[PDB]
Design a binder for these strands. Structure first.
Ligand SMILES: [K+]
Ligand SMILES: [K+]
Ligand SMILES: [K+]
Ligand SMILES: [K+]
Ligand SMILES: [K+]
Ligand SMILES: [K+]
Ligand SMILES: [K+]
Ligand SMILES: [Mg+2]
Ligand SMILES: [Mg+2]
Ligand SMILES: [Mg+2]
Ligand SMILES: [Mg+2]
Ligand SMILES: [Mg+2]
Ligand SMILES: [Mg+2]
Ligand SMILES: [Mg+2]
Ligand SMILES: [Mg+2]
Ligand SMILES: [Mg+2]
Ligand SMILES: [Mg+2]
Ligand SMILES: [Mg+2]
Ligand SMILES: [Mg+2]
Ligand SMILES: [Mg+2]
Ligand SMILES: [Mg+2]
Ligand SMILES: [Mg+2]
Ligand SMILES: [Mg+2]
Ligand SMILES: [Mg+2]
Ligand SMILES: [Mg+2]
Ligand SMILES: [Zn+2]
Lengths: 175, 190, 196, 139, 52
RNA sequence: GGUUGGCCUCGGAUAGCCGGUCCCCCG
RNA sequence: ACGUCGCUUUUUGAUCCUUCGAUGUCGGCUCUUCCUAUCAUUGUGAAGCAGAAUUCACCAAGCGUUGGAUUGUUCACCCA
RNA sequence: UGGGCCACUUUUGGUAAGCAGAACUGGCGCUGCGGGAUGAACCGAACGCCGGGUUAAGGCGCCCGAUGCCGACGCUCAUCAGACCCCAGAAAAGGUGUUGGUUGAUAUAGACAGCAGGACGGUGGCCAUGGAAGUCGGAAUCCGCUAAGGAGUGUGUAACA
RNA sequence: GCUGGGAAGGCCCGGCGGGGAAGGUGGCUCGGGGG
């Protein structure tokens, strides 16, 4: 699986009706995928691990994007996941701040790549949950729980370094 | 992790004033003036009180390595206050088993002559750092008193003397002879 | 075990302070284990003494005090290495014996000396093989009748100075009284009253 | 050293991106790189926004963090930022830079004529002041 | 014939020290890891051997 | 064979800079 | 020690890719340069470093590392 | 023509081999072109002579076409840094460098670290003995004062201290 | 055009309310300042 800006999908599937059980149970999963094609593929990857299902023996009855229910509100996201390292598999709990659930999961995929060199196919997201500010455990997330938060922007690096490319004045950094 | 704010404040006494020119601290106590820049550290220095004279160091968005510099600046500043108010006095004892170490203090306490270290004929000439005066104490038989305003300079002057009287090609655990810093303290005792 | 040990301590202190209505708070100086047993034996026949963590004392007399008043005055007074001694006798008969049963503790290495002791010029009486300690400290001695004799008084130590490692050993072999000090009372408490 | 701070109610000017040239108020801060941003009187709806495109101004509004857009607009309108902003040198340099870019060929010709006369009158007076100040005869 | 207190002072700088078992570095008595890269900041330390 | 107006100059800092003015000290 | 991980290409094998219209095949002599896995010398740390001597380790190849008897020898061994 | 060779995977001998021997498909041989700096076999793609458009694999500081994006989030300082299939060099074992994570524990009934006091009696506990007293050893592991003391963690002593 | 017949969101001080709190407003308490 690659990435981009992931979206949340509600994928509901079931086994094909057989003359053994006429109405097989319906199963639902939350899939964070770049698009619904990948989401359906990852759904079969997970239900095959949990239940004895295949894409050929079952069908997907629903696959719709789960829109964020409060994209204007800042909230802390706790993510439980398992990933395969070069020498084993590990369970991790990580925290992020974002406006959307899918944005937080996208941060996690980048963060696992940055800090643990974990590619998306090694990462297995198993629980995403909005946690209260008092339940946070990561100090990087906790330091932003300040009603009077105040910080300067210290050393503003010039980003238009080629417009102009040649100039007389040396750039300012204090703003 | 980058911490938003790491800050720490030092309290300036009444008889000494501190002047900031960017990250250049000028300390003007009764015993002289101490000046030292901190332009190698990206911190914010501020004089807070007009009544109690607080100096606050702030680091914004620092990693672990550069949060360690917040208290380093404060400790360096506190030594400036200590130096210009009480001064720095290092006492050195000249220990020897057989040959007594003869110490002669030349012009204004800026040159130190070590004669008979381990009985050899080479004369050790150690120059004190500027602003550091060496003298032979009148209390104990084998003492050297290093007095000055900068702890950096006084302690490095003491280390120059101690490292000059170094035994070589022998067992240092047996040949303990040399001049060693006995205690580190101040003048005026306050 | 720490929870049980702490709870056992709370039950012990609260029942003892309810039982005894008169007590002294006493400070503990550099008092060795041999001395606490000495006072504990000299006191247990008729009174009891309690010592321990100061916070256990404040916490016990803060949560389980509300049954009786006038005991809150100890809260701003139990500070430092201090503890309680519980008694049912009068103040004079317990204070004088507490001051009487002082123990002449020896001078340990690295201990300050509030008292000043000077060795006299007298026949020490020990063998003629301990002159190394006298020579190391600088006391000149000569052998008399097969013993070491001090020819003149020398000022061994001052008030409030540091005892050398090789200086305290001459005290121990000479068997003289050094600076000594016992379980000195800080103040008293008689049914909700503070005196000297 | 620092005088302008990222904080709740701090008004920032957007330097680039989809909302360049607008004024916004900082409602909340997230993850050190972005902030909850809302300009109700400058046509910027509430959304995340990197700190890189912001340039802090000297205006600070008073409202609690993550307050609703209505309260931000009331704080923005009372002691209105729009008129205060337009009166700053910062804004009128932005406006001057804008009208110079839209200047047409005819306007360029008339500016060239006005600048020519203005410089000749000024540079005359500079010579006169120089010549006058040159009369220094004193020990 | 060094008097004992000055003997302790000299031993402070000459004897009361830790030695790295990998690179023989002379470390302060309270050292837990060697300060030198060439041994990898190892924690294999031993006291400097006494002349007693 | 090119070219299709000129810029005749503080030093620099960047967790800071630039300009102006009265007293003090430098002839 | 029992185990176990490497490095080197100054040993000897393994292979047969280049050379059979030919790359002169050992040793010594002479001469230059290079490597360091340092014998000595410079500066150091450690010791079961008292001194003297010796051993272990670090920076380190600047400089030096010889005269001979027997042997074609490389090696080897002895004399100094 | 009846000398083959190479690559993924399966596979036999061998310590291994750019070694030797098989299976399957593709390739080189017989094949140029774009990319891998360079290269029979790798990746893309197979070719009449040209113009325009667009791509593949691979790239876009400069050599050298293309990021001269106000690209996003982190990690990392190396006095041998690192930098892209084949591919052209590295392991076990370490690090109180830094970053993230797992599990457990202590803490206002006051942790942790520092500075400053106590660290006892039976008991110099028994059997080893030449001295082994807490510390050369074999077993046991208890009591009281207790806030707390192990009939003992190490230094040291012939044993002590 | 479809979607959760989009999700959020804007205005109607949303009004009759209820509950929860905290990155705790006012007030109050303690500790440091300007007339
Ligand atoms: K070979
Ligand atoms: K061959
Ligand atoms: K040949
Ligand atoms: K020869
Ligand atoms: K020969
Ligand atoms: K044929
Ligand atoms: K044929
Ligand atoms: Mg300090
Ligand atoms: Mg020697
Ligand atoms: Mg040929
Ligand atoms: Mg030839
Ligand atoms: Mg030839
Ligand atoms: Mg080497
Ligand atoms: Mg043939
Ligand atoms: Mg054949
Ligand atoms: Mg083969
Ligand atoms: Mg072959
Ligand atoms: Mg052929
Ligand atoms: Mg073919
Ligand atoms: Mg081809
Ligand atoms: Mg090519
Ligand atoms: Mg290559
Ligand atoms: Mg074309
Ligand atoms: Mg290229
Ligand atoms: Mg180019
Ligand atoms: Zn080391």
């Amino acid at each position: 699986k690659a990435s981009g800006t992931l979206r949340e999908y509600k994928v509901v599937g079931r086994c094909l009706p057989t003359p053994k059980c006429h109405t097989p149970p319906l199963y639902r999963m939350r899939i964070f995928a770049p698009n619904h094609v990948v989401a359906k593929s990852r759904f079969w990857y997970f239900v095959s691990q949990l239940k004895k299902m295949k894409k050929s023996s079952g069908e997907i009855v629903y696959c719709g994007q789960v829109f964020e229910k409060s994209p204007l509100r800042v909230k802390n996201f706790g993510i439980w996941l398992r990933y395969d390292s070069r020498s084993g598999t590990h369970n991790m709990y990580r925290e992020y701040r974002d406006l959307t659930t899918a944005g937080a999961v996208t941060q996690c995929y980048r963060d696992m790549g940055a800090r643990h060199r974990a590619r998306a196919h090694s990462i297995q997201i198993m629980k995403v949950e909005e946690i209260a500010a008092s339940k946070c455990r990561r100090p990087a997330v906790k330091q932003f729980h300040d009603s009077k938060i105040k910080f300067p922007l210290p050393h503003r690096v010039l980003r238009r370094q080629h417009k102009p490319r040649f100039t007389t004045k040396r750039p300012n950094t204090f703003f | 992790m980058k911490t938003i704010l790491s800050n720490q404040t030092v309290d300036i006494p009444e008889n000494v004033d501190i002047t900031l020119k960017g990250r250049t601290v000028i300390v003007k106590g009764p015993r002289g003036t101490l000046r030292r820049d901190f332009n190698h550290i990206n911190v914010e220095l501020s004089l807070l009180g007009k009544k109690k004279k607080r100096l606050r160091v702030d680091k914004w968005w620092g990693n672990r390595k550069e949060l360690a510099t917040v208290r380093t600046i404060c400790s360096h500043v506190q030594n400036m206050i200590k130096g210009v108010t009480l001064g720095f006095r290092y006492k050195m004892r000249s220990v020897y088993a057989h040959f007594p170490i003869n110490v002669v203090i030349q012009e204004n306490g800026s040159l130190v002559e070590i004669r008979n270290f381990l009985g050899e004929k080479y004369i050790r000439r150690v120059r004190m750092r500027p602003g550091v005066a060496c003298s032979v104490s009148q209390a104990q038989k084998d003492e050297l008193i290093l007095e000055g305003n900068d702890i950096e300079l006084v302690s490095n002057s003491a280390a120059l003397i101690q490292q000059a009287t170094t035994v070589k090609n022998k067992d240092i655990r047996k040949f303990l002879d040399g001049i060693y810093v006995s205690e580190k303290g101040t003048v005026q005792q306050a | 075990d720490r929870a049980t040990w702490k709870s056992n301590y709370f039950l012990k202190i609260i029942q003892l302070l309810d039982d005894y209505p008169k007590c002294f708070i006493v400070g503990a100086d550099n008092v060795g284990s041999k001395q606490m047993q000495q006072i504990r034996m000299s006191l247990r026949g008729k009174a009891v003494v309690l010592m321990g963590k100061n916070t256990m004392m404040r916490k016990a007399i803060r949560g389980h005090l509300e049954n009786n008043p006038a005991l809150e005055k100890l809260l701003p007074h139990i500070r430092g290495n201090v503890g309680f001694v519980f008694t049912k006798e009068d103040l004079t008969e317990i204070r004088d014996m507490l001051l009487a049963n002082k123990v002449p503790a020896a001078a340990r290495a690295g201990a300050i000396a509030p008292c000043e002791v000077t060795v006299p010029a007298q026949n020490t009486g020990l063998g003629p093989e301990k002159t190394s300690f006298f020579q190391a400290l600088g006391i000149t001695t000569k052998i008399s009748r097969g013993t070491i004799e001090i020819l003149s008084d020398v000022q061994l130590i001052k008030t409030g100075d540091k005892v050398g490692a090789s200086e305290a050993t001459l005290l121990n072999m000479l068997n003289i009284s050094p600076f000594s000090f016992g379980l000195v009372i800080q103040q008293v408490f008689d049914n909700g009253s503070i005196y000297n | 050293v620092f005088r302008r701070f990222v904080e709740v109610g701090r008004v920032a000017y957007v330097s680039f991106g989809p909302h360049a040239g607008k004024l916004v108020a900082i409602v909340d801060v997230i993850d050190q790189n972005r902030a909850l941003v809302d300009g109700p009187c400058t046509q910027v709806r509430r959304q995340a926004m990197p700190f890189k495109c912001m340039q802090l101004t000297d205006f600070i509004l008073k409202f609690p963090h993550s307050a609703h857009q209505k309260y931000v607009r009331q704080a923005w309108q009372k002691a209105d930022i729009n008129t205060k902003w337009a009166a700053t040198r910062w804004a009128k340099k932005i406006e001057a830079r804008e009208r110079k870019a839209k200047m047409t060929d005819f306007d360029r010709f008339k500016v060239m004529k006005a600048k020519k006369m203005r410089n000749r009158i000024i540079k005359n007076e500079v010579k006169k002041l120089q010549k006058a100040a040159l009369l220094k005869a004193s020990p | 014939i060094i008097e004992p207190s000055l003997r302790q002072l000299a031993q402070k700088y000459n004897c009361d020290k830790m030695i790295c078992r990998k690179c023989y570095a002379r470390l302060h008595p309270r050292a837990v890891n060697c300060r030198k890269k060439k041994c990898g900041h190892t924690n294999n330390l031993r006291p400097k051997k006494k002349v007693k």
